[PDB]
């Protein structure tokens, strides 16, 4: 038409919802603009429709709205975001508007933010090993390109510093696999849900220090921003990441700051609609909603791009059985779990190796990729550490003097393992140095009890002294 239609029959405003009764023309899932009587425009999304009435959720706050003057206008039927290659180095808010003072982006394409599932035929196996520079991740919980590897954190634990260090130090090793020329740097897409000024300032300073803002795209949604806007931020971030990776052959690394806040907003919307709850408070469909976010990563046959995700989430009472960590561990391809007890002893990074897991480790290790002894060394380290922890629990009861020689050896191995292997500070370690330290630690035990390593590898590498590396 020459001028667009407006709907005025609004009789309900309560919380985030809003009912309009003359709106059968609005498509399900459409985006609308809510006009105040003073001229202010607020956005909203339609999730119900009938010949009787329609239900609209509001992104911004509902202060100042009235039932006599408010009107609803129509934007396009599908939530679409305009993307371009020119948007590298820009900053955006939670809904995609610029906040850096620069003119807006002229779109090359406009894409639906909900995305589409990847065809399981069109995928391929993640293979490339990524050297993060942290021994407890490189050796025992290896990260490969194309993996979803969330970080399970507490309240006072430093997950942000670990994420920044990984993003700074991450690189591939073409020389080990023989793939030829060195890579190009990762492109970082940073999506922030409800985040304090302290964490945001730290992240901005860290990215400015290394010059990574020229490659990055930032979607920011602060703690004082409206809550319902957090629904759209991960979807827009992943739309941009998918476009860059699969249309321009970039290697994209995506960081999601706190999935807990996203789940809180989701619970707010679900409880407003009287949905059937899940276990504690959260709606019953939360598994499906999280699955549409995580499962957008991976690699695609016949294309050079890749998408890697590092979500960060906080287990509330350090509880692994909470619904959010449970569903995340069901969907993702592993987890890195931080330990508070190691943090209290001054160990950084405080990664607890036993609850940690990497599902796609076996694709990226072995001969011709890193080295031939990687997997057996990892297994032996795991078994020895478990024995050390069990002997700790034993000497908590019976006392140190009652120990034999074997239990004392395992106990000393566990202590030295923590102090030297885990505690590394801000230093950067290559894979060879980490393997050398791991072999030096295993040399504290007799050859008889390490049954998980083949005798050739023992004959080749066993016998190193730790004093040469640390003295």
């Amino acid at each position: 038409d020459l001028l667009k239609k407006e709907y005025t029959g609004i009789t309900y405003i309560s919380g985030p919802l809003l009912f309009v009764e003359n709106a059968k023309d609005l498509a399900y899932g459409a985006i609308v603009d809510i006009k105040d009587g003073t001229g202010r425009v607020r956005g909203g999304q339609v999730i119900e429709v009938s010949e009787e009435y329609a239900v609209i959720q509001v992104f911004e706050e509902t202060t100042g709205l009235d039932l006599a003057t408010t009107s609803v206008s129509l934007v396009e039927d599908v939530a679409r975001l305009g993307v371009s290659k020119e948007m590298l180095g820009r900053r955006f808010n939670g809904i995609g508007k610029p906040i850096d003072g620069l003119p807006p982006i002229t779109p090359e394409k406009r894409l639906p933010i909900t995305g589409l599932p990847l065809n399981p035929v069109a995928r391929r196996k993640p293979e490339q090993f990524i050297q993060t520079g942290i021994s407890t991740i490189d050796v025992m919980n290896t990260l490969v390109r194309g993996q979803k590897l969330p970080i399970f954190s507490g309240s006072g634990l430093p997950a942000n510093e670990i994420a920044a260090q990984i993003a700074r130090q991450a690189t591939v090793r073409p020389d080990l696999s023989g793939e030829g020329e060195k890579e190009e740097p990762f492109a970082v897409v940073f999506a922030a849900m409800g985040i304090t000024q302290r964490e945001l300032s730290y992240f901005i300073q860290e990215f400015e220090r290394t010059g990574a803002l020229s490659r990055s795209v930032l979607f920011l949604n602060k703690a004082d921003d409206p809550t319902i806007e957090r629904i759209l931020t991960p979807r827009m971030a992943l739309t941009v990441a998918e476009y860059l990776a699969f249309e321009h052959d970039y290697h994209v690394l995506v960081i999601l700051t706190d999935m807990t806040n996203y789940c809180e907003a989701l619970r707010e919307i679900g409880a407003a609609r009287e949905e059937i709850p899940g276990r504690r408070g959260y709606p019953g469909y939360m598994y499906t909603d999280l699955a549409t976010i995580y499962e957008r990563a991976g690699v695609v046959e016949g294309k050079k791009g890749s998408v890697t995700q590092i979500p960060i989430l906080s287990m509330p009472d350090d509880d692994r059985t909470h619904p959010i960590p449970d569903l995340t561990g069901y969907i993702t391809e592993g987890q890195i779990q931080l330990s508070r007890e190691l943090h209290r002893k001054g160990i950084y990074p405080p990664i607890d190796p036993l609850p940690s897991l990497s599902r796609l480790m076996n694709n990226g290790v072995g001969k011709g990729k890193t080295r031939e002894d990687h997997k057996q060394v990892s297994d032996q380290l795991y078994s020895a550490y478990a024995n050390g922890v069990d002997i700790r629990k034993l000497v908590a009861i019976i006392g140190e003097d009652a120990l034999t020689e074997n239990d004392r050896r395992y106990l000393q191995f566990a202590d030295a393992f923590e102090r030297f292997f885990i505690n590394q500070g801000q230093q950067n370690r290559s894979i060879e140095e980490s393997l050398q330290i791991a072999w030096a630690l295993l040399s504290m035990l007799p050859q008889g009890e390490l049954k998980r390593i083949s005798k050739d590898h023992i004959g080749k590498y066993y016998g190193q002294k730790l004093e040469e590396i640390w003295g």
Binding site: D66, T196, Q197, R198, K222, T227, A271
Partner: protein, 578 residues
């Protein structure tokens, strides 16, 4: 205005009809008595109003009038040295009017309209002014109160009142378009006040308590939470911070607590002395009181009024400290209001939007550059009183995700009278790293090293205590016995502090530094003496232990001589012994 009548009453919830045209979160006048209410729902021709006063005796058919404006406060001269109700009503005027009981329906002004204030102009006619600029100064109790343009105002000025005495409601500046600017302006309490930039906190917030200043510091412009069961010492800690901290203006919010805890502050404070100006302590303090037997719905309003006033004093360039007595009562008020609306609740009946409110409240704190160009800061310390005494209740968990420091109290330490009863094992602070450049240049160059040594000694004592409990203290070797005794000396003499002693209530940074130096020097000497083969009892029978124990009771003036004498005594005693 919009006018309608009432048809439903249930507790503090009133439903009005005929209100077509009312806006969300406005303010309404309810009934013949003229109560205060706020609209949070709209449905057809009806509106849902929560009432901030008692609703007994109301009947169907009483009129409801809408003011068309949200809940706002009056910001201007005259707020200092005052005690206010939960919706900013002066309590002494209410006492003068009604008597000793707080009846509903009393209408008072927030600022005194009949006091003369001295006015000194700054601007000239023809000048261009913007939001947040300074135009004029007014003398207050030691301070200089600045008159600020409201943030959403731009224009040019050609009218200035000359230097004289005027009330708060006389136009002192007239803009070109005809806008008249007075000494005060109103601001809605739910909107955050604008700023230019936010800065990283880099200077400490000195509290006067040894354990909080040394082990778990909080920076100027940060946030902190102090949970604990009943009888742990939250209120005494907050009042000590109000007495002794170096903030320019202290705002104290009592949200659903005892009335005696507010009467004590009202009576005792005018007799004390301001640490940094020398005047009465009450001249820098603003009190907002809403006790437990006052109406429930007014608890939220008190919190928002307090944070709005603290934000206002920040824009003048001051450094403001805000203390909330309990946020659990605010959570209970939200639970009650949602229960009247029949919303589906989250865990323990709290509404699902509980965490968003806490996030929005704590986000007001920070060190900023004001619109006028000065630098201000607001720091927030909020006490959590979990009725579900375990630390897994939703309020505590939602608080821990935004705060920067976490001071955890223990009921076990409060039983044996080990105040402040701070659990140093479960507590943490994230501001330690940033304050080190200030500590190195303002206190001493080796201060972080001594702090690290003290923490190491505490950790080793913590392990050896479990060893002792499972075995016994006799089976321990001499080194472990020495570590246990030094840890006990630390816990008794350094960490512990009496808030009602005349001298022990306040401790400078250099006094804590001297005590730490004495303890570590003793530990080093006793460690070297064990190599010589001396018995552990000969160390413990030394009279120098008494000197360290009494050291925290020494005054600030006498302390350096005491410290030097004690160092000489330590050296001589450990030289001559054995």
């Amino acid at each position: 205005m919009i006018q309608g009548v009432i048809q439903k009453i249930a507790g503090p919830a009133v439903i009005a009809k005929g209100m077509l045209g009312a806006r969300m979160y406005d303010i309404c006048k309810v009934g013949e008595e003229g109560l205060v209410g706020e609209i949070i729902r709209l449905d057809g021709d009806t509106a849902f109003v929560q009432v901030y006063e008692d609703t007994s005796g109301l009947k169907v058919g009483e009129p409801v009038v809408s003011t068309g404006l949200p809940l706002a406060v009056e910001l201007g001269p005259g707020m200092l040295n005052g005690i206010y109700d939960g919706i900013q009503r002066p309590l002494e005027r209410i006492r003068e009017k009604t008597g000793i009981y707080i009846t509903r329906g009393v209408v008072v002004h927030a600022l005194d309209r009949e006091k003369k204030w001295a006015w000194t102009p700054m601007v000239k006619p023809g000048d261009e002014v913007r939001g947040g600029m300074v135009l004029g100064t007014v003398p207050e109790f030691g301070f200089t109160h600045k008159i600020l343009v409201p943030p959403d105002v731009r224009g040019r000025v050609k009218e200035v009142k000359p230097a004289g005495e005027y009330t708060v409601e006389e136009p002192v500046v007239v803009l070109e378009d005809g806008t008249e600017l007075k000494m005060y302006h109103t601001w809605p309490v739910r909107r955050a006040r604008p700023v230019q930039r936010k800065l990283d906190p880099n200077t400490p917030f000195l509290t006067g308590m040894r354990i909080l200043d040394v082990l778990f510091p909080v920076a100027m412009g940060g946030t902190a939470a102090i949970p604990g069961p009943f009888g742990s010492g939250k209120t005494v800690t907050q009042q000590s911070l109000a007495k002794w901290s170096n903030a320019d203006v202290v705002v104290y919010v009592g949200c659903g607590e005892r009335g005696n805890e507010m009467t004590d502050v009202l009576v005792e404070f005018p007799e004390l002395t301001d640490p940094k100006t020398g005047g009465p302590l009450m001249h820098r303090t603003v009190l907002i009181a809403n006790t437990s037997n006052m109406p429930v719905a007014a608890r939220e309003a008190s919190i928002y009024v307090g944070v709005t006033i603290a934000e206002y004093f920040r824009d003048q360039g001051f450094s403001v400290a805000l203390m909330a007595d309990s946020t659990s009562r605010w959570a209970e008020a939200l639970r009650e209001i949602s229960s009247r609306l029949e919303e589906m609740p989250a865990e323990e009946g709290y509404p699902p939007y509980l965490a968003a409110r806490l996030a929005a409240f704590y986000e007001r704190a920070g060190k900023v550059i004001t619109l006028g160009g000065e630098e201000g800061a607001v720091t927030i310390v909020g006490a959590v009183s979990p009725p579900g005494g375990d630390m897994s209740e939703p309020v505590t968990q939602s608080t821990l995700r935004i705060v920067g420091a976490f001071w955890r109290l223990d009921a076990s330490l409060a039983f044996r009278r080990h105040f402040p009863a701070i659990n140093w094992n479960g507590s943490y602070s994230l501001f330690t790293s940033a304050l080190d450049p200030w500590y190195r240049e303002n206190v001493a160059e080796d201060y972080p090293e001594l702090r690290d040594a003290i923490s190491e000694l505490l950790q080793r004592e913590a392990g050896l205590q479990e060893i002792v409990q499972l075995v016994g203290p006799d089976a321990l070797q001499d080194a472990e016995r020495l570590v246990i005794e030094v840890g006990r000396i630390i816990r008794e003499d350094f960490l512990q502090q009496n808030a009602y002693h005349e001298v022990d209530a306040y401790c400078s940074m250099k006094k804590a530094y001297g005590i730490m130096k004495m303890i570590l020097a003793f530990y080093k000497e006793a460690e070297a003496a064990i190599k010589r083969g001396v018995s552990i009892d000969e160390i413990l029978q030394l009279p120098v232990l008494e000197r360290i124990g009494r050291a925290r009771y020494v005054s600030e003036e006498e302390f350096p001589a005491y410290f030097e004498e004690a160092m000489k005594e330590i050296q001589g005693a450990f030289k001559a012994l054995a």
